[PDB]
Design a protein around this nucleic acid. Sequence first.
RNA 1: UACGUUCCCGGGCCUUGUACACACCGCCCGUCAAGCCAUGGAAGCUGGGGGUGCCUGAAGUCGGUGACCGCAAGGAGCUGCCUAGGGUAAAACUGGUAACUAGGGCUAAGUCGUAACAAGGUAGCCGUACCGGAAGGUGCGGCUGGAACACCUCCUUUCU
RNA 2: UUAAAGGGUCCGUAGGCGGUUUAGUAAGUCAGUGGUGAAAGCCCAUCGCUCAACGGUGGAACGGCCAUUGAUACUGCUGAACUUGAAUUACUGGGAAGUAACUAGAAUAUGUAGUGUAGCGGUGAAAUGCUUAGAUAUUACAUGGAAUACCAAUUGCGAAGGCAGGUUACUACCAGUUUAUUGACGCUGAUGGACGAAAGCGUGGGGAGCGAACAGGAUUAGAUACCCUGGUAGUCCACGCCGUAAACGAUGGAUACUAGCUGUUGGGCGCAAGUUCAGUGGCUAAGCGAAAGUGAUAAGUAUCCCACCUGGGGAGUACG
RNA 3: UAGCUAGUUGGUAAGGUAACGGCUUACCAAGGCCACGAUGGGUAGGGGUCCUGAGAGGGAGAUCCCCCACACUGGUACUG
RNA 4: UCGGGAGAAAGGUCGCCCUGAGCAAUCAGGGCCGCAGUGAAGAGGUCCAGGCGACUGUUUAUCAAAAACACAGGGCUCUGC
Lengths: 88, 121, 131
Amino acid sequence: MYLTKEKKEEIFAQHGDAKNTGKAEGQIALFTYRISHLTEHLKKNRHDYNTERSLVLLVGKRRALLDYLKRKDINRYREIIKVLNIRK
Amino acid sequence: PTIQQLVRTGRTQITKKSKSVALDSCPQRRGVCTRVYTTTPKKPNSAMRKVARVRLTNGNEVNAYIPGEGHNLQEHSIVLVRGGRVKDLPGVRYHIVRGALDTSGVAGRTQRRSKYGAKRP
Amino acid sequence: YTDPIADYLTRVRNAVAANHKVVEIPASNLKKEITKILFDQGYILSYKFEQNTVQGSIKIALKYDKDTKEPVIKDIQRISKPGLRKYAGAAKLPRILNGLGIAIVSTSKGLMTGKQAKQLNVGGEVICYVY
RNA sequence: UACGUUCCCGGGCCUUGUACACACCGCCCGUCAAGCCAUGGAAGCUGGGGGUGCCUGAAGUCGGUGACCGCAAGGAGCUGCCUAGGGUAAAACUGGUAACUAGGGCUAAGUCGUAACAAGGUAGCCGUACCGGAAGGUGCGGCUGGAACACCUCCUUUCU
RNA sequence: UUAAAGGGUCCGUAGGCGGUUUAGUAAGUCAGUGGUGAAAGCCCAUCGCUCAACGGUGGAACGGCCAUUGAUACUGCUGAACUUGAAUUACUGGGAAGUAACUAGAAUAUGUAGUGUAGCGGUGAAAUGCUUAGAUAUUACAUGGAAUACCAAUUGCGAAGGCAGGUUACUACCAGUUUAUUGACGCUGAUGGACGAAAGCGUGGGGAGCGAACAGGAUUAGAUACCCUGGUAGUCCACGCCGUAAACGAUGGAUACUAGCUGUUGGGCGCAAGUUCAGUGGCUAAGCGAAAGUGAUAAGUAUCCCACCUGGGGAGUACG
RNA sequence: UAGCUAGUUGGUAAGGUAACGGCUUACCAAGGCCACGAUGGGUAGGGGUCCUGAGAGGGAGAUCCCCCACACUGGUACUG
RNA sequence: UCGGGAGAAAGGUCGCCCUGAGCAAUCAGGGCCGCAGUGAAGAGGUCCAGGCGACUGUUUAUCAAAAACACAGGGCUCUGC
């Protein structure tokens, strides 16, 4: 998960309002990006439990945000999971 | 502790295991004796206590203690066990009523006559 | 937090134990009502509702005697808790300190005392009690 | 003859540790040997209810037939479903008992050793592995819930 | 905490709890009314048996339930708003924080070559052991394995276990602050998942030193031990298996309050003094505690959630 | 004691019972319950009440009254 | 040894005619016949416990088919072309 300032600005502008670095949608997108870019490192470093636990923590944070969205607005949750390919 | 923990699983109340169990929760039980002998206390007492192996009517083999002095208690006699253990003989947890069907009372007893089954002189 | 009312009582109790003069508790409608009731009953000297905060502050002045201080607030505790809420009609109100202490009871009319609500024959929820 | 108190014995004071207090001539551990008590395992033996799968199925209600009684109804006689009872097969639960066998609690405190309690005379304990008549010994890791001792080799600074 | 009792540690499902303001309903909560809550029984009062027991009458009680009418302070639900909680982003930094791959020196062991002769080693003293087949000792070279003196410590990091020669790559985490951003998105968490010292197990390598078991020597009345000489598994590596510790701070995780003195680690503001956050030690006041002690990093005063305790032995034993 | 139920779950038409109803039959679908304890095992008639306790609670269900089940052990129907 | 044991064990129907539902098949209702309906022939007896050998397999043509030999697996030792 090599995250640069330009990469973060791009992943936030892809969801809109590149200056809005606190939106739940942008946070879920960033978490998904750095989880997909970390599960691959975990395939060549299968004995890296230190980063396996951090990946689990990121999954937990993303699930907390998804539960917040599910409890607040039922439509945005479906939209974000369909566009980001989450929830199985 | 926590009210939620108490709501989930409350306080467990125990059953308070009884004292005299081999008499079927009856005040007295009839029985037949098979071996009348004498035993020793634990410590520091020194005596020769008279006990009898009694087989109650409900099929229970117990050891009863003969109170007082003077008795017949042959190898086969109808006795009436009442209960009450002693802190000297390990195993004897019952007493025999003096003045019952076949057991004898006491002679020359004048103070505690209600016990030991003694008539009024 | 878990109980702003419990925190409001705990700050006062700790300041009384530490022999302070003023407290700067956060503000809310229920805390303001409790402070008004306590000032009307005569357990605190004065109270000020300080603005200029997103929530607001309550500055309360604690009362002690002019000799042998002996703080008048000896025991201020809660009866209803967020883990167990205790309500009661106008027949089961407590007997705090054998009629010498106060018991705040949130009633359908407003926030009253255990003795000021029994006359109105209204019930409600017992919030706290002060000796 | 006595340099001297480092050792042997006895006594005093301060601190320290103790599982001792009739007070170390203390307390206490384990195996083996002899009795009593209750509870497990085990080749087998013997039962008790309830369930399921089949066969047979009394009476009785309800259908079919009814070439025989009757003038019509209807009935006699066969017969079908349901179901108590009986038989059978394999399992499940549970009680009693059994050659032999493992461990536990007491008894008079028998035999062998002294493992722990003082720095208990090899500090103790925990997890684990191996070994030994027995308490136990040793290897690896961890703790102080251990005692006695318990301050230091460099002395002082430039952007390398 | 030391008497029985904090799970080895985190993540997290169901569940439990809910920062401020505001609008609506009135489910919980409160009040009134109607119905019911049989009789008998208990209690109160009053009458008849000469009193009492007993009997008659009345009230209260029957803590409850159904329908309906009100109040809206608190909890629940729906809607809206806010930033203090929480999270993200930007800048300064922080470390023995992980995985993988390279590399250096000291020391031990072995081998070759040179020199050289009678000892070497060990203990409270000895012996077993290696040695005239040239040991111990010394010089030079080579081979191989494990661990990293000084720095170096009540330092630092990690959820815990734990992490120490040097370098690189791939990650993770934390702290402070001028920012910008979302707006309760939070805490705990039974079943469950992951990690988890050492020892142990399976397969394939490696094996310098150490060394369970074992073999000799020694002490002893005996010595299956302490002591001495050797030594297999193991300790190491690459995939796995179990999931146990005095896994200890014998102290669960959050949040908020309540006196100080004195070091130190990483930041900010400072020309210095010094001040303010985030961690890490010592003394002690009040307060707690049976006492020892603890004491702002509480065992102080409160609230939420989880686990555990209920005399000793039998017993973490028997059965499944 | 972690899975249970196969007329079992719902529906469509008949037979029915005093009366609705898988109560029964014919057909279609695979449903229904379960950690807030199904299923299985042990025990037990239930209540007004009695004893005790400051109260909250705890322990029993004789005699009096109300409801349910049974009549040697089981099954079936008639009269009404 | 999770593959088995197992066709475990223990049971029910099978003929002819008619009707209906049916995808040909088959099923559901009735009726008839006989002592008997897979009416003849062909087609596993099963269970319990112990010894030996893991297993399939091979062996004394012409008196021994086995617990003997072999076997996959384990070990020691030799061998640098």
